[PDB]
Design a binder for this molecule. Structure first.
Ligand SMILES: CCCCCCCCCO[C@@H]1O[C@H](CO)[C@@H](O)[C@H](O)[C@H]1O
Ligand SMILES: O=[N+]([O-])c1ccc(O[C@H]2O[C@H](CO)[C@H](O)[C@H](O)[C@H]2O)cc1
Lengths: 396, 125
């Protein structure tokens, strides 16, 4: 949407928030290995803690964020903990991993699980509540995140060889301007039969439409996320010196996310006219094609296209899911099911799926494992067309 | 899964010395293998590497245009053809198998399984 004060407030919020995340999440493994000297096999204990506490905070954030509608109480804590970004990585999390590895991963498990693994979707669900009130499209807001994500990647790559810590300090600063935005943003004020309630939220589990939507999450969405976990190593497996392979990967991510933003700009216009479930199916198809495609790749060119292929599914997955959520279910639960049906249950299945696929990486191998993931992702996207209540592809 | 390495020995400058590497354990669907070598003092140097599903093969600079590498699925065996050997080819040639961690095919560190080694010697006269 065009010039509307409340839109620029939260559009810049996504830009500066995912500018925080772009500094750690993409290229996270390179933080623990090349700089902090954790073994390439030890990192599982850290991801486990981050996964454990995100399991915990996601259902919290979902139920909470819905209880207090657009009150802003939740995002102020997050925006508060984000100010800790710099001192956490530099002086706390880092040296606590040179010390006992276990404890150092707990404080990272709780911190990052809170601010990012669970905090990010809570910010997405909140700004989607602002989406329908102040009259604009959610996709036009979240494309800002793809640009900050990219720009931050551009800055960490430039600064990796000189003063990598510089990017963390930016995070804390961004969090402060993230607070300025949150102050001048206008929504319901504090001091707080059609409202939210736990009883009606647990009765929500009994709804079949939830079960099917969940099936899509763990069947075709979770599988896609574990596929991307170790894609960067598989990406470097087509290049000679790794620091070349990672350099290319850093180009495709930065540029690709710009391509991802552009697509997200128009995504609302498409997702509006072809339905909600169709965006999930289309995303699920782009997903399945990326897995099965990576199973047969044979040239760096072929694998680069497959990475950029990620940039085409994100807009139809994010803009699409909310557009399927807030139509098949009551809006008053929009933030709760998105946090529990998507993030929590996705996070749940990713526990078993991640260790199961990791055994194939050792047993059969990358592309070979990608073939299995591709079949189940493709497979569950098939039954998804019939299960998901809604129009569907036939409606043309 | 281990790595046996056939071939090796003494050859006159100009001969062709075909190396072979088989293994026992698992089918390397996906997995791609390669060869390295080490002389008197040089750190492990790259020579060749090949993956399944495509003749995709990679070769080093000092070796380009003379060594040919091929693979055989099911048989789970890969060979290294050497032609136009010169004395600087003296070394102990290792077999390998790539790892899921690490960065690229050209680096020794990126291969989890190493072979025992198979020395080839090449003299002028
Ligand atoms: C130096 C960095 C500049 C960032 C300053 C951010 C100002 C914080 C605004 O305060 C908050 O205002 C809310 C209403 O908007 C109240 O609900 C809340 O009680 C109060 O805590
Ligand atoms: O931990 N999480 O909750 C979480 C991590 C990454 C993430 O990534 C999306 O946002 C990025 C920036 O917009 C990229 O566009 C990326 O391609 C998208 O998939 C979403 C959620």
């Amino acid at each position: 949407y065009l010039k509307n004060t409340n839109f620029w407030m939260f559009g810049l919020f996504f830009f500066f928030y995912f500018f925080i995340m772009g500094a750690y999440f993409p290229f996270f493994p390179i933080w623990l290995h090349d700089i902090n000297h954790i073994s390439k096999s030890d990192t599982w204990i850290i991801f486990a803690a981050i996964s454990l506490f995100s399991l915990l905070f996601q259902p919290l954030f979902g139920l909470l964020s819905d209880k207090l509608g657009l009150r802003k109480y939740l995002l102020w804590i997050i925006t508060g903990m984000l100010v800790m970004f710099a001192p956490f990585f530099i002086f706390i999390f880092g040296p606590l991993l040179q010390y006992n590895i276990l404890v150092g991963s707990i404080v990272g498990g709780i911190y990052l699980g809170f601010c990012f693994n669970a905090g990010a979707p809570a910010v997405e669900a909140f700004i989607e509540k602002v989406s329908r009130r102040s009259n604009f499209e959610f996709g036009r807001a979240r494309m800002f995140g793809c640009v900050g994500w990219a720009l931050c990647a551009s800055i960490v790559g430039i600064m990796f060889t000189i003063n990598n810590q510089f990017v963390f300090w930016l995070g804390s600063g961004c969090a402060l301007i993230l607070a300025v935005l949150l102050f001048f943003a206008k929504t319901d004020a504090p001091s707080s039969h059609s409202a939210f309630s736990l009883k009606l939220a647990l009765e929500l589990f009994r709804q079949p439409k939830l079960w099917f939507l969940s099936l899509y999450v763990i069947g075709v969405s979770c599988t896609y996320d574990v596929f991307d976990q170790q894609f960067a190593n598989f990406f470097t497996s087509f290049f000679a010196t790794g620091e070349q392979g990672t350099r290319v990967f850093w180009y495709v991510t930065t540029m690709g996310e710009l391509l991802n933003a552009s697509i997200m700009f128009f995504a609302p216009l498409i997702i509006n006219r072809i339905g909600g479930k169709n965006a999930l199916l289309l995303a699920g198809t782009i997903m399945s094609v990326r897995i099965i495609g990576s199973s047969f790749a044979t040239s760096a060119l072929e694998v680069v296209i497959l990475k950029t292929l990620h940039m085409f599914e994100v807009p139809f997955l994010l803009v699409g899911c909310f557009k399927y959520i807030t139509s098949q279910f009551e809006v008053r639960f929009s933030a709760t099911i998105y946090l529990v049906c998507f993030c929590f249950f996705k996070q749940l299945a990713m526990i078993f799926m991640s260790v199961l696929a990791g055994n194939m990486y050792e047993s059969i191998g990358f592309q070979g494992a990608y073939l299995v993931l591709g079949l189940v992702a493709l497979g569950f996207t098939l039954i998804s067309v019939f299960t998901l209540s809604g129009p569907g592809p036939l409606s043309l | 899964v281990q790595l046996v390495e056939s071939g090796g020995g003494l050859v006159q400058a100009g001969d062709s010395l075909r190396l072979s590497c088989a293994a026992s354990g698992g089918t390397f669907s996906t997995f791609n293998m390669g060869w390295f070598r080490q002389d008197l003092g040089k750190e492990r140097e790259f020579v060749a590497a090949i993956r399944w599903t495509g003749g995709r093969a990679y070769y080093g600079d000092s070796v380009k245009g003379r060594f040919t590498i091929s693979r055989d699925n099911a048989k789970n065996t890969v060979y290294l053809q050497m032609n136009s050997l010169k004395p600087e080819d003296t070394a102990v040639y290792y077999c390998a198998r790539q790892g899921t961690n690490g960065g690229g095919y050209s680096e020794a560190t990126s291969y989890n399984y190493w072979g025992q080694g198979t020395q080839v010697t090449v003299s002028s006269h």
